[PDB]
């Protein structure tokens, strides 16, 4: 294997998540587990509002809440920039302009704390319209396929992206979310700078039935494409 991180993702890794936020000063805090399968490029986790009632919709918070899960296929190995930053791991930065409302802003920390993969999150959310379909809850619970494109950052050792999410609305319209994101190791050791591609990124949201706490399942599926074989 390609990269010393690489083969840390072989098997069936567990997964913690551990999200603070404030969104116009709406406090709330989100735990999640579950594990993840790289080989596949899959993983199921389970969250939970700890702090009671989630102030925004879940489907807002998915791309926040793992990009080192991708399948990256055989001939793309030299490109899994994400893997190869562990186990010291990265810092993923991003904002995400929700259009005609506010903006999140994020700095996330995804590294191995012993055999788990964590990601620990700080969200910050300014400038919503309290009666906006983010901060009134009209997204449907549901979620689209997108493709993430990744570009090299040579200069920070790193990789940036940027991707627009379409998230459904109750009434059948659809709220926009441009997200550009940065990545940076943590660690000192070499990482791989990938070229051009990108991660088509599958997400479907479920209820465990006998969960009585505010809370979302989510199954992800992702691989990489976008260099020829």
């Not at 919503?128 to 379909?133: L, Q, T, V």
């Not at 039935?209 to 505010?214: A, C, G, L, Q």
């Given at each position: 294997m390609v990269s010393k991180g690489e083969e840390l993702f072989t098997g069936v890794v567990p997964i913690l998540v551990e999200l603070d936020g404030d969104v116009n000063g709406h406090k709330f805090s989100v735990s999640g587990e579950g594990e993840g399968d790289a080989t596949y490029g899959k993983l199921t986790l389970k969250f939970i509002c700890t702090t009671g009632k989630?102030?925004?919709?879940w489907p807002t918070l998915v791309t926040t809440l793992?990009?080192?899960?991708s399948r990256y296929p055989d001939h793309m190995?030299?490109?899994?920039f994400f893997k190869s930053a562990m186990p010291e791991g990265y810092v993923q930065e991003r904002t995400i302009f929700f259009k005609d409302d506010g903006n999140y802003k994020t700095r996330a920390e995804v590294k191995f704390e012993g055999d788990t993969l964590v990601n620990r999150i700080e969200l910050k959310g300014i400038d919503?319209?309290?009666?906006?379909?983010i901060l009134g809850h009209k997204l449907e619970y549901n979620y689209n396929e997108h493709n993430v494109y990744i570009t090299a950052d040579k200069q920070k050792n790193g990789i940036k992206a940027n991707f627009k999410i379409r998230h459904n609305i109750e009434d059948g319209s659809v709220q926009l979310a441009d997200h550009y994101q940065q990545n940076t190791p943590i660690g000192d050791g070499p990482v791989l700078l990938p070229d051009n591609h990108y991660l088509d990124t599958e997400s479907a949201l479920s209820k465990d039935?006998?969960?009585?706490?505010?809370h979302m399942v989510l199954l992800e599926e992702v691989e990489a494409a976008g260099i020829t074989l």
């Open positions: 989630l102030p925004v919709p793992v990009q080192c899960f190995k030299q490109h899994d919503f319209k309290e009666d906006g379909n039935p006998n969960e009585k706490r505010d």
